[PDB]
């Protein structure tokens, strides 16, 4: 699809094995000095010279069996940081040149979030997947133009062995909080601590305790131990693939959780710049498990039937 600036458009999917949503951009400069440098993404204000990804609110929803289910609580900057916590930083935050006045920005946003462990939403005769995208004022700023173009859903191969329905949501802690116990959902599977600024040289100065409590695990975190704990999913020699005031916690089916964030001080930012909490839970059911068994048996019988001999 393509959406104008100051515009909204839906999207419907009837029979697909859908996983992951592309977001492409296409920025058009006014003069050559508007792209003499790289298009560093503004978030708040005070350098509104380029893209501002906060002002797109992608909602996904599933109509399934006469009911509704909600995905993607509507912030493209949150989905950009959460997808590119182990990706990005060249093809999204600083973009790819193509011409003298053309530069793009690209993210793959999977439904589970994890690039190496995806979900695959199946579809049938009466269910439908609906993707609703808004573009509002202040999405491109000064040096960009109102002839930008965006992109749409990507599909996936028939890995529709789907167990579940991957939910994804935020918490958005306030300005000068000192301690906040953030109770989270049932089956949470992944927890991430995202920040969208680096006001000074790359020193965190934000966290001083993090307590993840469950039935399956306790994990207590010093600020230095967070800097280590972000560096388990990256096997590059560099410790981070995003802005170095963040942290990250991948798991496998936590059954209950409370994430206590024990902040430092006023360098926890103000005016919604500050650190957001993003969790990616799911729901599942017996009939989806039975359709998973039926789909695996149909593909298995097809593969056994389609091999002759020799």
Q: Is 46 in the site for its own copies (CB under 8 A)?
A: no
Applying the rule CB under 8 A, the residues between 20 and 39 that interact with its own copies are 22, 24, 26, 28
Q: Is 269 in the site for its own copies (CB under 8 A)?
A: no
Q: Which own/partner pairs from 273-276 qualify as long-range (CB within 8 Å, at least 24 positions apart)?
A: 273/43, 273/44, 273/196, 273/197, 274/173, 274/174, 274/175, 274/195, 275/173, 275/193, 275/194, 275/195, 275/206, 275/245, 276/78, 276/170, 276/171, 276/172, 276/173, 276/193, 276/194, 276/195, 276/196
What is the Cα–Cα distance from 55 to 19, expressed in whole angstroms?
A: 24
Applying the rule CB under 8 A, the residues between 107 and 126 that interact with its own copies are 107-108, 115-116, 126
Chain breaks in the chain (C to N over 2.5 A) after: none
The structure tokens listed for 77 are 């900057």
What is the Cα–Cα distance from 155 to 57, expressed in whole angstroms?
A: 21
The H-assigned helical ranges of the chain are: 76-83, 223-229, 286-305
Q: Is 251 in the site for its own copies (CB under 8 A)?
A: yes
Task: List, in sequence order, every beta strand (DSSP E) within 16-173.
Answer: 18-28, 59-64, 67-71, 96-97, 102-109, 128-135, 153-155, 164-166, 169-170
**In this chain, which stretch among 9-17, 32-40, 190-198, 290-298 interacts with its own copies, using CB under 8 A?**
9-17
What is the Cα–Cα distance from 42 to 51, expressed in whole angstroms?
A: 6
- Which residues on adjacent β-strands are paired with residue 271? none
Q: Is 134 in the site for its own copies (CB under 8 A)?
A: yes
Binding mask 187-226 for its own copies (x = CB under 8 A): --------------xxxx---xx-x-xxxxxxxx-x-xx-
Binding residue for its own copies, selected from 37, 47, 183, 266, defined by CB under 8 A: 266
Nearest CB to its own copies, comparing residues 49 and 127? 127
Binding mask 60-99 for its own copies (x = CB under 8 A): -x-x-xxxx-x--xxx----------xxxxxx----xxxx
Closest approach, Cβ 142 to its own copies, in A, equals 15
What is the Cα–Cα distance from 249 to 179, expressed in whole angstroms?
A: 19
Q: Is 40 in the site for its own copies (CB under 8 A)?
A: no
Q: Is 9 in the site for its own copies (CB under 8 A)?
A: yes
Closest approach, Cβ 24 to its own copies, in A, equals 4
Number of residues that bind its own copies (CB under 8 A): 129
Q: Is 291 in the site for its own copies (CB under 8 A)?
A: no
Q: Is 49 in the site for its own copies (CB under 8 A)?
A: no
What is the Cα–Cα distance from 115 to 118, expressed in whole angstroms?
A: 6
Closest approach, Cβ 49 to its own copies, in A, equals 20
Q: Is 309 in the site for its own copies (CB under 8 A)?
A: yes
Q: Is 157 in the site for its own copies (CB under 8 A)?
A: yes
Binding residue for its own copies, selected from 32, 36, 46, 237, defined by CB under 8 A: 237
């Amino acid at each position: 699809m393509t959406i104008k600036y100051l515009s909204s458009e839906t999207e419907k999917l009837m029979n697909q094995t859908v996983s992951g949503i592309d977001v492409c951009f296409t920025l058009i400069g006014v003069d050559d000095d508007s792209f003499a440098s790289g298009s560093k993404n503004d978030y708040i204000s005070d350098t509104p010279k380029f893209l501002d990804p906060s002002n797109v609110h992608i909602k996904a929803t599933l109509k399934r069996g006469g009911k509704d289910y909600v995905l993607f609580s509507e912030n493209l900057a949150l989905l950009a940081k959460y997808s590119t916590i182990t990706q990005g930083r060249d093809q999204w935050e600083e973009g790819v040149k193509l011409a003298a006045k053309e530069m793009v920005h690209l993210v793959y946003i999977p439904f589970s979030g994890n690039t190496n462990w995806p979900a695959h939403i199946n579809l049938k005769d009466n269910d439908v997947l609906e993707v609703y995208v808004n573009v509002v004022r202040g999405a491109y700023g000064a040096e960009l133009d109102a002839n930008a173009c965006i992109c749409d859903v990507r599909t996936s191969p028939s890995i529709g062995v789907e167990k579940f329905i991957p939910f994804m949501t935020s918490y958005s802690i306030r300005a000068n909080q000192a301690t906040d116990l953030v109770n989270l959902g049932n089956d949470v599977t992944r927890i991430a601590l995202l920040s969208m600024t680096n006001d000074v040289s790359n020193i965190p100065n934000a966290f001083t305790d993090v307590t993840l409590s469950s039935d399956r695990l306790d994990k207590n975190f010093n600020s230095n131990q967070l800097i280590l704990e972000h560096s388990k999913c990256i096997e590059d020699s560099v410790r981070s693939h995003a802005n170095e005031v963040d942290s990250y916690l991948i798991h496998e089916d936590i059954e209950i959780d409370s994430a206590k964030v024990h902040l430092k001080m006023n360098p926890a930012k103000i005016r919604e710049n500050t650190i957001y909490l993003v969790r990616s839970h799911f729901q599942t059911s017996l009939e989806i498990l039975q359709k998973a068994v039926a789909m695996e048996e149909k593909h298995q019988s097809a593969d056994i039937a389609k091999v002759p001999a020799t």
